Amino acid sequence: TTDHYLLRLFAIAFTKRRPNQIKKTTYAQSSQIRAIRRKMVEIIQREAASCTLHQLVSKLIPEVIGREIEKATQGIYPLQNVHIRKVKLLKQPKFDLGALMALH
Amino acid sequence: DLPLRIRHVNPICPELRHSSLKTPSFGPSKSGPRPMEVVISFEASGKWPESLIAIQRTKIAFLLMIGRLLERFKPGEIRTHVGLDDARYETENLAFLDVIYASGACFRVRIQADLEESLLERQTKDKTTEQYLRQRASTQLASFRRTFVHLPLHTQYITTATTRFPALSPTIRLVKHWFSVHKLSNHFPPELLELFVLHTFLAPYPWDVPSSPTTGFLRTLLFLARWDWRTDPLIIDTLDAWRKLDPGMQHTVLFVATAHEQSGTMWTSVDGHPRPSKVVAARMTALAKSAARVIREQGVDLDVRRLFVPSLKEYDVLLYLNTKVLKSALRTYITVDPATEMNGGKGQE
Amino acid sequence: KWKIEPFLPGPFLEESSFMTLFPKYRERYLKDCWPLVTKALEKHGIAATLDIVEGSMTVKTTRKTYDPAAILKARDLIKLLARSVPAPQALKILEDGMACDIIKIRSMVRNKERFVKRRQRLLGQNGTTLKALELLTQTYILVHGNTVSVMGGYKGLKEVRRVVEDTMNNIHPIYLIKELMIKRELAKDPALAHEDWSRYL
Amino acid sequence: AAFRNACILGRIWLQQRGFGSDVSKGGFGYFEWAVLLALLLQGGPADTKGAAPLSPSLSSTQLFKALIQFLSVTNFAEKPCVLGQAKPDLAGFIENGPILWDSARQLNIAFKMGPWSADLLHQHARWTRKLLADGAVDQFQPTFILKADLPTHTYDLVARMDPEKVSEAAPDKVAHEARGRHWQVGHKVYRILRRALSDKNMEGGERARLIHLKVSPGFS
Amino acid sequence: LVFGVARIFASFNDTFVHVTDLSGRETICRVTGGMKVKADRDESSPYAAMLAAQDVAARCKELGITALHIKIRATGGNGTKTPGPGAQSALRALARSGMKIGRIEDVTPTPSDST
RNA sequence: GAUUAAUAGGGACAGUCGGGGGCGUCAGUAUUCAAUUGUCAGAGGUGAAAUUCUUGGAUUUAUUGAAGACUAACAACUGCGAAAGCAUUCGCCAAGGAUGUUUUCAUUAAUCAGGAACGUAAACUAUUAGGGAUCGGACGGCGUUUAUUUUUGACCCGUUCGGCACCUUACGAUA
Numbered sequence A: 001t002t003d004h005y006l007l008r009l010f011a012i013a014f015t016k017r018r019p020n021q022i023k024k025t026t027y028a029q030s031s032q033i034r035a036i037r038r039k040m041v042e043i044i045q046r047e048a049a050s051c052t053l054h055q056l057v058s059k060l061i062p063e064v065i066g067r068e069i070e071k072a073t074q075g076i077y078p079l080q081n082v083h084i085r086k087v088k089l090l091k092q093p094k095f096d097l098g099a100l101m102a103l104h
Numbered sequence B: 001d002l003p004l005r006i007r008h009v010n011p012i013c014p015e016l017r018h019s020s021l022k023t024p025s026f027g028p029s030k031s032g033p034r035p036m037e038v039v040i041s042f043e044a045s046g047k048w049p050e051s052l053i054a055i056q057r058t059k060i061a062f063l064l065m066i067g068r069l070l071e072r073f074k075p076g077e078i079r080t081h082v083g084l085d086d087a088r089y090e091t092e093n094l095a096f097l098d099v100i101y102a103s104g105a106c107f108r109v110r111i112q113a114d115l116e117e118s119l120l121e122r123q124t125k126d127k128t129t130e131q132y133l134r135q136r137a138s139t140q141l142a143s144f145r146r147t148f149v150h151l152p153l154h155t156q157y158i159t160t161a162t163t164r165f166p167a168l169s170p171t172i173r174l175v176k177h178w179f180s181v182h183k184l185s186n187h188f189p190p191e192l193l194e195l196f197v198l199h200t201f202l203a204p205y206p207w208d209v210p211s212s213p214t215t216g217f218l219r220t221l222l223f224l225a226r227w228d229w230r231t232d233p234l235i236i237d238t239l240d241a242w243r244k245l246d247p248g249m250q251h252t253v254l255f256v257a258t259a260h261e262q263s264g265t266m267w268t269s270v271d272g273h274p275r276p277s278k279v280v281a282a283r284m285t286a287l288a289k290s291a292a293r294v295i296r297e298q299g300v301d302l303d304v305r306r307l308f309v310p311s312l313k314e315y316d317v318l319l320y321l322n323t324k325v326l327k328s329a330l331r332t333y334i335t336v337d338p339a340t341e342m343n344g345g346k347g348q349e
Numbered sequence C: 001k002w003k004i005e006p007f008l009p010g011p012f013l014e015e016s017s018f019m020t021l022f023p024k025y026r027e028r029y030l031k032d033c034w035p036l037v038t039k040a041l042e043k044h045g046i047a048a049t050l051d052i053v054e055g056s057m058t059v060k061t062t063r064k065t066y067d068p069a070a071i072l073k074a075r076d077l078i079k080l081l082a083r084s085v086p087a088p089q090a091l092k093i094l095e096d097g098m099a100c101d102i103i104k105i106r107s108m109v110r111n112k113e114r115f116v117k118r119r120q121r122l123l124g125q126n127g128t129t130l131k132a133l134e135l136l137t138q139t140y141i142l143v144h145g146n147t148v149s150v151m152g153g154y155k156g157l158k159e160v161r162r163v164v165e166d167t168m169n170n171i172h173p174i175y176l177i178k179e180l181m182i183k184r185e186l187a188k189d190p191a192l193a194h195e196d197w198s199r200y201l
Numbered sequence D: 001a002a003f004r005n006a007c008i009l010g011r012i013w014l015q016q017r018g019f020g021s022d023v024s025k026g027g028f029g030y031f032e033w034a035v036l037l038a039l040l041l042q043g044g045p046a047d048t049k050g051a052a053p054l055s056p057s058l059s060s061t062q063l064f065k066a067l068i069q070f071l072s073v074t075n076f077a078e079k080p081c082v083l084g085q086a087k088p089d090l091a092g093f094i095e096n097g098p099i100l101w102d103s104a105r106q107l108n109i110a111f112k113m114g115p116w117s118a119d120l121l122h123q124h125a126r127w128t129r130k131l132l133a134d135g136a137v138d139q140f141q142p143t144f145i146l147k148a149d150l151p152t153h154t155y156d157l158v159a160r161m162d163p164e165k166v167s168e169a170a171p172d173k174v175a176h177e178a179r180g181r182h183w184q185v186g187h188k189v190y191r192i193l194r195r196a197l198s199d200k201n202m203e204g205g206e207r208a209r210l211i212h213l214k215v216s217p218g219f220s
Numbered sequence E: 001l002v003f004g005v006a007r008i009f010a011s012f013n014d015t016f017v018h019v020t021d022l023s024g025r026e027t028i029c030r031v032t033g034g035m036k037v038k039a040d041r042d043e044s045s046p047y048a049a050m051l052a053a054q055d056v057a058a059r060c061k062e063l064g065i066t067a068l069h070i071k072i073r074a075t076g077g078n079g080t081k082t083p084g085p086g087a088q089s090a091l092r093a094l095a096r097s098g099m100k101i102g103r104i105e106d107v108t109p110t111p112s113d114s115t
Numbered sequence F: 001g002a003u004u005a006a007u008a009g010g011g012a013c014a015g016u017c018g019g020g021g022g023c024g025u026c027a028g029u030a031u032u033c034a035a036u037u038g039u040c041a042g043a044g045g046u047g048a049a050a051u052u053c054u055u056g057g058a059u060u061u062a063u064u065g066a067a068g069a070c071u072a073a074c075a076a077c078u079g080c081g082a083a084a085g086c087a088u089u090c091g092c093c094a095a096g097g098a099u100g101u102u103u104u105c106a107u108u109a110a111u112c113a114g115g116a117a118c119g120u121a122a123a124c125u126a127u128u129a130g131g132g133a134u135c136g137g138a139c140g141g142c143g144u145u146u147a148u149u150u151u152u153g154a155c156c157c158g159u160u161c162g163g164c165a166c167c168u169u170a171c172g173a174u175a
Helices: A028-045 A053-060 A064-071 A099-103 B052-072 B117-125 B132-164 B168-181 B188-201 B211-226 B279-297 B302-308 C024-031 C036-043 C071-083 C085-090 C113-123 C123-139 C154-168 C173-188 D005-017 D029-040 D062-075 D115-133 D174-179 D183-199 E046-063 E086-096
Strands: A004-014 A079-091 B008-012 B036-042 B079-084 B095-100 B104-112 C017-021 C045-052 C056-061 C097-104 C137-142 C147-152 E002-010 E015-020 E026-030 E066-072 E100-106
Touching: A004 A028, A004 A064, A028 A064, A028 A079, A028 D029, A053 A064, A053 B008, A053 C147, A064 A079, A064 B008, A079 D005, A099 E046, B036 B132, B052 B079, B052 B095, B079 B211, B079 E015, B104 B132, B104 B302, B132 B188, B168 B188, B168 B211, B168 C036, B188 B211, B211 B279, B211 C045, C017 C071, C024 C071, C036 C045, C045 C071, C056 C071, C071 C085, C071 C097, C071 E086, C071 E100, C113 C123, C113 C137, C113 C154, C123 C137, C123 C154, C137 C154, C147 C154, C154 C173, C154 E026, D005 D029, D005 D062, D005 D115, D029 D062, D062 D115, D115 E002, D174 D183, E002 E046, E002 E086, E015 E046, E015 E086, E026 E046, E046 E066, E046 E086, E086 E100
Parallel strands: B036 B104, E002 E066, E066 E100
Antiparallel strands: A004 A079, B008 B036, B079 B095, B095 B104, C017 C056, C045 C056, C097 C147, C137 C147, E002 E015, E015 E026
């Protein structure tokens, strides 16, 4: 983030079974999976690199990221549900009571 | 809950980065920095249109439905409205959700989408047959690039720096008040001013980090008095084409570059300062040289009010204005406390 | 010391709820075996809904649920109903002394044809070794693809765990059934109640 | 070979630093830089090794930056008051007591050094060590100017100590005359202002309201 | 209602009724299963879990928290991933003696690949 | 002076396809070991026990760090490789399959003596004639969803090659 917090985002995304279909397996091809994962990492990088941590949590709460991944991956293969399953803060290099009290 | 899920809400304010000239109190709708600009990004969609007026009317449609939910719900002590903008020229369709909280905080709300920058690049690219629109189209694209895109990372970096540098906030307030009494802040954008005061805190050589607001203010005025802007650009830690194409500096005087902004032009040349010998910029370096000269010749005493009284010399026409105000206006509803007419200004009257 | 009494008599503040997801071939069978499930879960106090559109079984604790372990019973019940245990057995987990277990056996054999041979060796000729294991261990064993789903008392869960690992590790289940029959014969008389029984197996 | 040019750079360093050989400014001047360069060329680390960027065949850049680094970390600016001392050839770091010492002549060189100017020399040395370790921005022309001694909170004090029994709160007696060489009032206001401005947290973390202090006797 | 977090480690050999604060750091009161039963055979039994849950609920009602969030686990590395009888019996006795239950979760260590 | 261009070959190009291979890299838990706290009487095994660890605090609770291993669920009446075998992401390196082409030399080929490269177990056992599935191309299209409208992809359908496997029938057989 812009406040120099490094963090890992783990996103999960299940494939959409299209209504009015007859075939039982909704398998995406492997190249299609690689394209989906490329668009997923592109979306989460482009929409998590610009904001601070408080705006990132405010976007994580109503799941705007998974909604935009669902909206932008449906030209490659439609996805049943995209969630971000883990956020892990690795290093926080600052202790600042100014922003930490501007939160509270 | 919306048809398009929220993704990012980033206020871009000097009230976030602790550099509004007046520190906020509850209420003051008169005040300049009171409507607090906030950029907002939705999730990605392909259903935004492909023209400027249409995308902006879709934007105010989303602002209208946000304001409709806000006026419906039980926090409706919050009041809101939608209002136009002119600061981006030629985009007459820019509107905001301006929202007042019960504790008097006013917030300017604007939506960002992914196709605006590409559309303004389209406007820079097209109309090639006219052959004179590209410079002012670049001005509009980079004014957008100021107010919408770079201000988020800007307030993030100044917010993460202002805790480690604590006198920086009254120092930018004092240098900005000096620019206010010397009539320079209307052509000078504020981000250039915050970077200008920020050089003395983050590149403090050969002095210490300023542990006093007056120390930081004096270091800013002497760095301006010793800054020869011809040969020296200001590179801060929070080029070789422009002095070739502009050797007399008729277009740009200040070059303030960062790892944020590596072009050095976004807060100086984009605004379009008039810059010959007899204008705002050379007048600014002349006032700072006069400040350093007075603080050399007479010292530091109660006659430091010469730095805060303007000279009003070397101006062609001078026009004095008075506005239809009562006594103690505007100050008492700005929340600033001069003017002893407002009795009890030392208390919560 | 081991018997468990049925619950005689609001113990839930946050209204708990669980979900599991099933495919379509199970959606048919669940759609026409569901009223038994929701009847017994209404007798336990937990609302159970089925969603053929998304393919999801949900349980949720109502206002008048009093047994707090009932939500764990219901979560295991919908797990087994998703994993295609038949419906009276999945409802038989709702008794007090029963518990289920899933044994992942695909990690135990590197080869494929050897794994198929050893799984069919676990299943036996005409299912006779499997129902012999079910009799000797008082369990319900379902050799389910790459896993093995067992139900019953906790003692039987432990013995079928040992037998399934030893069957995958090339010890024969007929040998293990002979071992269990010897252990049953030795535990019948308590004259040999505490000795080391390794001198007999 | 480059001893002369290294002393030249040290004199330029000190004349912009405001320090000199005078007793009223700390006594660290050209002579103290020169004897420091001699002691560091003939030793200085804790196991009495000849110091690594201080061999006699090196350039004035290396001699100057190594005197900067040793004044910035080892035992020569703030550590020769509290945590360490030096000895002459073969020169060695000793982790006890304050002096810049010569046992062959029984003279301490830093007798003119107050702890205030010592700590000022250490923040200057640490800053110049960072400046010489900087590899992107050119750093010859920044030479430190001393707003630590002249800030905007420069407090002007007019004190008449006449007569001394009724115009000074502490007695100027025979032992104070034997100890101090007419800078007794200055060292007094130094210790008084440090004890005034020093806090003390419960968890052992020492914090003060100030980092550095200077008392200049104006019009001396 | 002060929510304390009850870790119930229900294995096949012994059950651990453990009560911590919301942090996980400061143990309030724990009673293992085997300290209430004289027999190591019957250490993991519903009677043992009932006695342990009654003692833990008595101590935590003397301290006055009267509300728990319950996290149930078992031996999960190469173990069974199913709780023993201690989980059901301890939760039954725990909410049968006071103790408005909050959020129930089965936090078993599930390996992504163990052996 | 030089045939059919084979319903046999080998090659070229294009979009591709694959849990095929090598090298690096990125993660994920779990286990063990160690440290920091809250501990405060057993813990561990077993059908019961015992050996063992346990007021210098075991097992447990929380947080970090290291090491080695492996890649759950997805995971299949599937995919790839000649075989053993092959499942974390990304990058690089060659190779291979099928399809399509408005691609070339025209018997180059088939089969294996000799030889050459890769390497604790067992234990119940010229068509058949199509159809339903399946995946890899290529083509076609009434249409739903991408799509703010064109791409393009997902779903449905038909044609066509190619391939793992099911059932029926044998076209028969035969030890």
